[PDB]
Design a binder for this molecule. Structure first.
Ligand SMILES: CCCCCC[Se]CCCCCCCC(=O)OC[C@@H](O)CO
Ligand SMILES: CCCCCC[Se]CCCCCCCC(=O)OC[C@@H](O)CO
Ligand SMILES: CCCCCC[Se]CCCCCCCC(=O)OC[C@@H](O)CO
Ligand SMILES: CCCCCC[Se]CCCCCCCC(=O)OC[C@@H](O)CO
Ligand SMILES: CCCCCC[Se]CCCCCCCC(=O)OC[C@@H](O)CO
Ligand SMILES: CCCCCC[Se]CCCCCCCC(=O)OC[C@@H](O)CO
Ligand SMILES: CCCCCC[Se]CCCCCCCC(=O)OC[C@@H](O)CO
Ligand SMILES: CCCCCC[Se]CCCCCCCC(=O)OC[C@@H](O)CO
Ligand SMILES: CCCCCC[Se]CCCCCCCC(=O)OC[C@H](O)CO
Ligand SMILES: CCCCCC[Se]CCCCCCCC(=O)OC[C@H](O)CO
Ligand SMILES: CCCCCC[Se]CCCCCCCC(=O)OC[C@H](O)CO
Ligand SMILES: CCCCCC[Se]CCCCCCCC(=O)OC[C@H](O)CO
Ligand SMILES: CCCCCC[Se]CCCCCCCC(=O)OC[C@H](O)CO
Ligand SMILES: CCCCCC[Se]CCCCCCCC(=O)OC[C@H](O)CO
Ligand SMILES: CCCCCC[Se]CCCCCCCC(=O)OC[C@H](O)CO
Ligand SMILES: CCCCCC[Se]CCCCCCCC(=O)OC[C@H](O)CO
Ligand SMILES: CCCCCCCCOCCOCCOCCOCCO
Ligand SMILES: CCCCCCCCOCCOCCOCCOCCO
Ligand code: NA
Ligand code: NA
Ligand code: NA
Ligand code: NA
Ligand code: NA
Length: 460
């Protein structure tokens, strides 16, 4: 059930001989996830800088181990990667610089945790401690592997979670340092929701991020391992879904609606450039009072075909920047929002937008056939909310022109074959995004950019 160590994995594969494959089998105490990935990426900077291009291939091996003893259990997953350049074999990976340059080949400890399920007799209730997968269904608050203590309670009528998390390391042979935004940042979070009618859920969610770190002092040189800000930030959200992320729905329509208020304060570092160097000049504090919304509707046209629409907006700008929404930093923004077994990036495989000073309109269609195939075609159009503010993270490394709201448009295609089928144990997927920059990117930029993957995944 939901406590299974692979429950949140997007692949949704089931190894041969496992208890999930045949309930008469004993739970596996070990297994191996094998992934071969090709990536083509051109050009992440839209042709405004050297590099930014990938055409490369890699293998990623993830052995895992599991033990169970009454109410106690424990889990480890490691990772070994070898690739022809530094490609993305992990949709959850740390974004990347002395101590932050990935190697083409590396080892990592991905998960390591102990779990106690004995506080209540519900097997949907358990407490997990260690580096662990945290995920909620939208992917927009948490979808990551992180050191945490997290309590889950999942039953028919009531779901609830509460946890604390903090990065202390990447646990990787190549990344020696944390990203500055992660260093000394503690997260606490929880949620509670109820299935008020069958397949309809309403809930509230909270997340708090607190920075204990400090900013560089005036006159000190500032480099890429230094923070740009320290924050005490709270996200408070309402969320309603009707089979929003359920690829097996029988309802004719599915939907999601969420609204999130972001409050708190940030201390923003200021800098100046002095002879090929960046020098701290001070800092400025200010309130954040920002808002985000994400809405979607999916038509289940028949057992195979689905289509739908989405709108999302993260506020931007405002008085002294108070309306600049931002996400938690634990999100993936990947979800099953097209109604298939495959997860898709909600704001484009190429653009990979964070909901921050961003408005997006989305159209999609999908097709699936039992547990054997699925395919999705997604269109997005993106605009800034405030044309004099930056946006947040994205898969595009290029300057925005002041005063231009047209970020661009994107077309994505995801196509998947599942192999042994009752429950597949392997898959091959094409996942690609084509991004057409709009006027906010300005002259001298490429007319289109793409990011495309082929992934072959086998679980043993
Ligand atoms: C598991 C993944 C395997 C997938 C195999 C797909 Se092969 C087609 C990839 C399509 C990539 C085309 C880019 C080729 C290129 O342009 O090479 C530079 C050239 O000018 C001279 O070096
Ligand atoms: C230092 C350079 C050496 C690397 C050479 C190996 Se390129 C491995 C293929 C990597 C390209 C795969 C990306 C996805 C894609 O473009 O598939 C197109 C196809 O499936 C549509 O029919
Ligand atoms: C840094 C972390 C510390 C390293 C070790 C923690 Se993982 C070893 C867990 C292994 C513990 C298994 C034993 C529990 C038990 O009760 O087994 C008896 C049997 O009768 C029950 O059915
Ligand atoms: C400063 C660096 C310290 C952090 C390093 C993490 Se410990 C080494 C990775 C520990 C994770 C164990 C799993 C890796 C693995 O064994 O993959 C091998 C593959 O050949 C199996 O088919
Ligand atoms: C607030 C939630 C806490 C949950 C903790 C549970 Se797991 C921590 C076990 C392991 C702790 C490892 C510490 C390693 C380290 O500090 O190395 C730094 C270096 O890699 C670069 O930062
Ligand atoms: C049951 C769960 C329900 C979740 C649904 C939330 Se719908 C939020 C309505 C959105 C209303 C917010 C108004 C924002 C605004 O003023 O737009 C800026 C304008 O000044 C410049 O274009
Ligand atoms: C069915 C259950 C009821 C669901 C209630 C959700 Se109605 C969404 C109203 C939308 C509210 C927008 C608030 C905007 C904000 O707080 O940040 C910007 C500003 O305050 C900084 O000057
Ligand atoms: C109708 C559906 C469109 C949806 C977007 C799928 Se991404 C398009 C490229 C994905 C296909 C393979 C990657 C292309 C490639 O390798 O060429 C490199 C070369 O063009 C350098 O610009
Ligand atoms: C900071 C949080 C703790 C991290 C724990 C890493 Se546990 C490594 C794999 C743990 C999975 C089981 C370990 C030992 C075992 O199972 O021996 C008993 C027998 O084989 C049962 O079948
Ligand atoms: C019963 C014990 C079973 C666990 C054995 C698995 Se090997 C340890 C991998 C998981 C533990 C993390 C290892 C990497 C690390 O600690 O690096 C921190 C940083 O480099 C320091 O600053
Ligand atoms: C089964 C054991 C569970 C017991 C642990 C309960 Se912790 C509740 C999680 C909820 C997370 C709390 C967040 C608090 C916050 O962020 O307030 C900041 C303030 O508003 C700034 O203005
Ligand atoms: C059968 C009834 C049991 C009642 C007592 C059980 Se206390 C469980 C501790 C942990 C409960 C989780 C708390 C997280 C939360 O509800 O916060 C979300 C929201 O944002 C808040 O504003
Ligand atoms: C089996 C029975 C379980 C009963 C548990 C009920 Se959980 C439903 C919560 C859904 C209630 C929505 C409350 C709206 C709200 O307080 O948001 C304010 C906004 O976020 C502040 O800015
Ligand atoms: C990027 C690709 C474009 C995405 C389309 C966006 Se919305 C289309 C959903 C609306 C489609 C639902 C209508 C199906 C229907 O009308 O069935 C036939 C008739 O009613 C007998 O039942
Ligand atoms: C690349 C994979 C996805 C392709 C994009 C699909 Se766009 C619309 C999706 C679904 C619409 C397609 C037609 C639906 C149908 O065939 O049945 C309609 C019948 O009139 C009612 O019973
Ligand atoms: C290099 C990347 C490859 C990624 C996956 C390509 Se799968 C072709 C899907 C296209 C599926 C169209 C029709 C499918 C169907 O109905 O097949 C019945 C089936 O054979 C019953 O076994
Ligand atoms: C079958 C997957 C091919 C994996 C290619 C990775 C090779 C790593 O080369 C590192 C170069 O040194
Ligand atoms: C057959 C795939 C094996 C991949 C293992 C990658 C090896 C990583 O070691 C590099 C260590 O340097 C740090
Ligand atoms: Na398994
Ligand atoms: Na298992
Ligand atoms: Na470039
Ligand atoms: Na329990
Ligand atoms: Na669906």
């Amino acid at each position: 059930g939901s406590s299974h160590h692979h429950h949140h994995h997007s692949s949704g594969l089931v190894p041969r001989g496992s208890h999930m494959a045949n309930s008469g089998e004993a739970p596996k105490n070990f297994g191996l996830d094998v992934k071969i990935t090709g990536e083509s990426e051109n050009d992440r900077d839209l042709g405004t800088a050297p590099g930014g291009t990938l055409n490369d291939i890699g293998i990623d091996l993830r052995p895992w181990a599991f033990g169970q003893w009454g109410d106690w259990s424990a889990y480890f997953m490691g990772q070994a990667v070898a690739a022809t350049d530094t490609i993305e074999t992990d949709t959850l990976q740390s974004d990347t610089n002395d101590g932050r340059e990935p190697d083409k080949s590396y080892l990592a400890a991905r998960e390591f945790w102990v779990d106690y399920a004995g506080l209540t007799a519900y097997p949907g209730e358990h407490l997990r401690f260690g580096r662990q997968r945290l995920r909620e269904d939208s992917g927009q608050w948490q979808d990551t592997n992180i050191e945490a203590l997290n309590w889950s309670f999942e039953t028919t009528l009531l779901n609830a979670h509460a946890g604390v998390a903090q990065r202390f390391s990447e646990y990787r042979t190549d990344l020696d340092e944390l990203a500055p935004e992660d260093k000394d940042r503690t997260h606490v979070f929880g949620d509670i929701s109820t299935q008020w009618a069958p397949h309809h859920r309403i809930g509230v969610r909270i997340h708090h991020a607190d920075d204990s770190g400090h900013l560089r002092r005036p006159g000190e040189e500032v480099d890429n391992l230094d923070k740009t800000y320290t924050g005490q930030l709270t996200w408070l959200g309402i969320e309603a879904t009707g089979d929003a992320y359920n690829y097996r729905s029988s309802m004719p329509l599915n939907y999601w609606a969420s609204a999130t208020w972001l409050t708190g304060d940030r201390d923003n570092l200021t800098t100046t450039t002095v002879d090929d160097r960046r020098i701290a000049t001070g800092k400025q504090s200010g309130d954040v009072n920002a808002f985000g919304v994400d809405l979607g509707l999916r038509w289940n046209i028949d057992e195979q075909w689905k289509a739908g629409v989405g709108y999302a907006r993260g506020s931007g700008g405002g008085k002294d920047g108070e309306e600049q929404f931002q996400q938690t930093g634990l999100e993936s923004n990947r979800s099953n929002f097209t109604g298939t077994r495959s997860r898709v990036h909600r704001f484009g495989e190429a653009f990979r937008g964070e909901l921050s000073n961003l408005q997006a309109a989305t159209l999609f269609g999908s097709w699936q056939l039992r547990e054997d195939y699925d395919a999705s075609l997604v269109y997005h159009k993106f605009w800034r909310v405030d044309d004099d503010s930056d946006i947040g993270t994205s898969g595009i490394n290029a300057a925005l022109q002041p005063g231009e709201k047209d970020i661009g448009q994107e077309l994505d295609l995801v196509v998947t074959k599942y192999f042994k089928v009752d429950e597949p144990s392997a898959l091959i997927r094409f996942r690609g995004g084509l991004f057409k920059p709009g006027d906010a990117y300005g002259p001298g930029t490429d007319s289109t950019m793409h990011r495309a993957f082929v992934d072959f995944i086998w679980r043993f």
